[PDB]
Amino acid sequence: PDSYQKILLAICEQAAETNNVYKKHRILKIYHLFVSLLLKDIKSGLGGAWAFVLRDVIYTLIHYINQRPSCIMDVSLRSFSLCCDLLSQVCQTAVTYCKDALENHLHVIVGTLIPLVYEQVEVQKQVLDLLKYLVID
Numbered sequence: 030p031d032s033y034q035k036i037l038l039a040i041c042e043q044a045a046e047t048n049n050v051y052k053k054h055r056i057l058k059i060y061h062l063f064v065s066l067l068l069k070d071i072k073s074g075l076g077g078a079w080a081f082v083l084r085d086v087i088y089t090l091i092h093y094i095n096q097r098p099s100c101i102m103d104v105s106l107r108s109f110s111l112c113c114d115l116l117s118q119v120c121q122t123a124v125t126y127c128k129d130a131l132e133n134h135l136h137v138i139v140g141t142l143i144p145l146v147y148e149q150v151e152v153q154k155q156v157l158d159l160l161k162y163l164v165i166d
Contacts, residue, residue, distance in 0.1 A: 030078040036063065037085055054108045057093075061115045068122045080130075083123055087134055090116045091141050101149065113155045120163060135163065 040063065044056045064086055067075065075082055093112055098105060120138070123130040131138070145156045 030076040033067070033075060033078055033082050034085075037082070037089075041089065050102065050104045050108075054104050054111075057108050057111055060089075061111055064115055064119065068119065071122060071126055079127075083119070083130060084134065086119055087116070087138065090119070091137060094141055094145070106149070106152075109152055110155065113152060113159070117155065117159045117162070120159065124163075131163075139163065 040056065040060050044053060044060070047053060047056070067082065071079070090112055094109070094116075097109065101109070116138075120131065139160070142156050142160055146153050148156075
C-alpha cells in the first residue's frame with residue numbers, strides 16, 4: 030500500500046525540484062495520467078489506502094491552484110485547465126463511489142474554488158461547473 034505513497038512523493042519531488050513551465054506542465058500531465066489510472070481501479074479499492082491517496086491528491090491540487098503567477102501564459106493556462114479537470118474528475122469519482130468521502134474536505138475545496146471565479150472565462154466556467162456538481166447536483 031505504501032507504493033502509491035512512494036510514487037506520489039516522487040512525482041511531488043520532481044515537480045518541486047524544477048521551475049521550468051514546460052517541465053512543470055509535463056509533470057502535471059504525468060500526474061493526471063497516474064491519477065486517472067488510479068481512479069480506473071477504484072472498484073476494489075487501493076488496499077485500504079484510498080482515503081490517504083484521495084487526501085494527498087486533493088491537497089496537492091489545492092496547493093497547485095493556490096500558487097500561480099499573476100500573468101497567465103498559454104502553457105500556464107493549459108496547466109491550470111488540466112489541474113481543474115483532474116480535480117473535477119477526482120471529486121466526481123469520489124462522490125459517486127464514496128458518499129462520505131467529501132464530508133471532511135468539501136469546505137477547503139469550496140474555499141479554494143470561490144476566488145477562482147474572478148479569472149478568465151474558460152476556467153470560470155469549469156469552476157462554476159464543479160461548484161454546481163458539488164452543491165446543486
